[PDB]
């Protein structure tokens, strides 16, 4: 019972090349190179699913630090005041508030200053 | 398309560093 692998092999190669669409040069044309490119993209995607969380955390802290300093308080002092005042707002909301609602942030820093003092 | 090569090559002074 001879088995020909032309149909199955062509299906597998098409699937990999489809996933390699948009890559430069042989990385999107040649299967031997495309397979390596697709696998590497898989490793990076897994790794960056974790770096994204920390990258955005850094961005929020920088935004809060700029906004807090503009109000006359350091980031570390401002966060400590919130903890003392029992405020559970996280960095994502704090950065969002600072960008859009300046008055709300002014109230927060005022609350933080009162708790510290 | 085989084209066997029957070309011997000269023996250079071996590295023998």
């Amino acid at each position: 019972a001879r088995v020909k692998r032309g149909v199955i092999a062509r299906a597998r190669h098409k699937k990999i090349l489809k996933q390699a669409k948009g890559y430069y040069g042989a990385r999107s044309r040649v299967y031997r190179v495309a397979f390596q490119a697709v696998i590497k993209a898989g490793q990076y995607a897994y790794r960056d699913r974790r770096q994204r969380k920390r990258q955005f955390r850094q961005l929020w802290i920088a935004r809060i630090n700029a906004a807090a300093r503009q109000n006359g308080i350091s980031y570390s002092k401002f966060i400590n005041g919130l903890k003392k005042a029992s405020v559970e707002i996280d960095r994502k909301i704090l950065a969002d508030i600072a960008v859009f609602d300046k008055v709300a942030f002014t109230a927060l820093v005022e609350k933080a200053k009162a708790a510290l003092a | 398309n085989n084209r066997p090569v029957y070309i011997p090559r000269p023996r250079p002074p071996h590295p023998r560093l």
Partner: protein, 201 residues
């Protein structure tokens, strides 16, 4: 157990062990698989690197050539000659114990009775060797795919069903598990029934 009739309405006595035993799924499957394997003939073969026409001369020298080392034109990784493990004519028939064969046959017969796929009638015969007569006889009985089992094989019934694909005529001695399973309905004559217990025991 008791086997009812549909034409003469006559009682029949048959041992329940051979017609009322449980259905052994595993046992029947093995016998059916064994029967199919025994039907093969395994008439096939390829040529190994020793049986391929050619010569043992090395295509090129071991060293100096810039290409891969090669030993013969008949290597399996070469075009036009090879087959690493060439097939040979083999027998696929497998052994089945006598008791296991009998047990599967008893199991099959019991379940046919349970699914009312087995019909027992009196002598089944055709007056003349005409397929038209046999077709009429089976038409009024609402049977299209039937296996006729008779105690004695008569040329008249054999010739009538020869050109009927859906109809088979057989003797009690020549009974196989596959035929009983495959056919939708099985019709057994009174004589045919008796020989079954004697051979099945």
């Amino acid at each position: 157990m008791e086997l009812v009739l549909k034409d003469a309405q006559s009682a029949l006595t048959v041992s329940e062990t051979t017609f009322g035993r449980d259905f052994n799924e595993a046992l029947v499957h093995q016998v059916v698989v064994a029967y199919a394997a025994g039907a093969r003939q395994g008439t096939r073969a390829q040529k190994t690197r020793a049986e391929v026409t050619g010569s043992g001369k090395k295509p090129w020298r071991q060293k100096g050539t810039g290409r891969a080392r090669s030993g013969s034109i008949k290597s399996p990784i070469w075009r036009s000659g090879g087959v690493t493990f060439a097939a040979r004519p083999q027998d696929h028939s497998q052994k089945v114990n006598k008791k296991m064969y009998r047990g599967a046959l008893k199991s099959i017969l019991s379940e046919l009775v349970r699914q009312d796929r087995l019909i027992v009638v009196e002598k089944f015969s055709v007056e003349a060797p005409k397929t038209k007569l046999l077709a009429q006889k089976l038409k009024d009985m609402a049977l299209e795919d039937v296996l006729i089992i008779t105690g004695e094989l008569d040329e008249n019934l054999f010739l009538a069903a020869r050109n009927l694909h859906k109809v088979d005529v057989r003797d009690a001695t020549g009974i196989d598990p596959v035929s009983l399973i495959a056919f939708d309905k099985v019709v057994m004559t009174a004589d045919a029934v008796k020989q079954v217990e004697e051979m099945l025991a």
